[PDB]
Amino acid sequence: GLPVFITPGSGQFLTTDDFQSPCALPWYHPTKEISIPGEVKNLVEICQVDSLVPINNTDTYINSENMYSVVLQSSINAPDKIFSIRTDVASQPLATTLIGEISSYFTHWTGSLRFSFMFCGTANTTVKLLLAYTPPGIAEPTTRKDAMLGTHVIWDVGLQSTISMVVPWISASHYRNTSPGRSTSGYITCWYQTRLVIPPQTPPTARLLCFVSGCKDFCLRMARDTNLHLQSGAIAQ
């Protein structure tokens, strides 16, 4: 036979290998691909989907819809903070979003994130609000003016339902690690730019729902078996 000689890396199985292989079932033929709707080629189209943050991750809301929602108080003359979050894609709560899980299935990420926000309160009601981002190396802001020094948007709550805005990609490195240990990507932070004003005898309350998705900018590397989910023992049947 041809004189051949064998390199190391022979005779192993690697779960992430790439090769031809022989057939168990020669002469077989598969069923034809009918034109089923809902084609897909990549994970990024899933990233493009807006999904809700369970923003309001606490005991009093977790076992319910309400952890996707925040409640606003039209009673308050103040500039102050409504909420804040990290921005690291596999941090809590963001990891629990589908982009979060897809990022949690991965080790590297890059590109800017889309964020979106609906004024879910009574149609008769008005406000304008500050949604802001904090470039890190610094504490999460404690005045509205701090957030005004960050990159931010002021929401003209017009007839249109939703404000949508982007955390710009400002990683030193072209990628960042998907889960921080002792590390940070920056903060989302939210504030009363005006007070919220309902008209008289409206419910003394309002709701806000918050969305995120990958921008056209977004991408991942180092697919890894995700942090997000655990199996204990045998899966019964």
Binding site: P37, G38, D50, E65, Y68, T97, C120, T122, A123, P203
Partner: protein, 250 residues
């Protein structure tokens, strides 16, 4: 933000709605000679069944938890559609769906509507159990979600709406074609879908080839004495087809 809708004989509108996304952009159509399995020229009731039909009134409150249906079973009683379904071993159809949900300018709250695929519901109870036919196939009567005492619980599906009744997170549910009834944004919401399956057509009564979910993501309220609003849903089947004619199914 205004639409009018016309299928088979019947028409629908909202003058406070944002248009449906067509599911995956695929406008509904009949089977192809290139993809088909069934041999006959199939049953095209056309206008007499690719027309609207609508469900009994549900109604909702701040205390309400959710509602859903499984299709075609949710339409088994829709005259021509219903019997043409029951008299064939197989068929296929897409759907146009609109949900009717007007409030005053003086209400708040929001529902998510999700069209959803096989949506394979989890049991209520733990262990070696699965969902019984009576509950997977609630008919047009549907499944509202309630706090208490549903009998035969071992065969009941779970009530756990924020776990999408299958152990998946809500809020990621926007992965499917979906809309929001938001009382500020709109007074109604709409979605349309082609047929879908791993198979070119399917055993209608034996498998709910599509499903529809509506969830109170934000609680209903107004200060007005009208503390609650009905919801109703209307559906037209699309390109509806049936094959393997025999007796009426039981």
């Amino acid at each position: 933000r205004i639409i009018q809708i016309t299928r088979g004989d019947s028409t629908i509108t909202s003058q406070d709605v944002a248009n449906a996304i067509v599911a995956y952009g695929v406008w509904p159509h009949y089977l192809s000679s290139k993809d088909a399995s069934a041999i006959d020229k199939p049953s095209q009731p056309d206008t007499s069944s690719n027309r609207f039909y609508t469900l009994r009134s549900v109604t909702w409150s701040s205390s309400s938890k959710g509602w859903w249906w499984k299709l075609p079973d949710a339409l088994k009683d829709m005259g021509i559609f219903g019997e043409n379904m029951f008299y064939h071993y197989l068929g296929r159809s897409g759907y146009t769906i609109h949900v009717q949900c007007n409030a005053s300018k003086f209400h708040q709250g929001t529902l998510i509507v999700a069209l959803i695929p096989e949506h394979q519901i989890a049991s209520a109870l733990h262990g070696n159990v699965n969902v019984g036919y009576n509950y997977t196939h609630p008919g047009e009567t549907g499944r509202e979600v309630k706090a208490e005492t549903r009998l035969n619980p071992d065969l009941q599906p779970t009530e756990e709406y924020w776990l999408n009744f299958d152990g998946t997170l809500l809020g990621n549910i926007t992965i499917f074609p979906h809309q929001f009834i938001n009382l500020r944004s709109n007074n109604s919401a709409t979605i349309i879908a082609p047929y879908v399956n791993a198979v070119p057509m399917d055993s209608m009564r034996s498998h709910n080839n599509w499903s529809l979910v509506i969830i109170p993501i934000c609680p209903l309220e107004t200060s007005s004495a009208i503390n609650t609003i009905p919801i109703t849903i209307s559906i037209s089947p699309m390109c509806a087809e049936f094959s393997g004619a025999r007796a009426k199914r039981q």
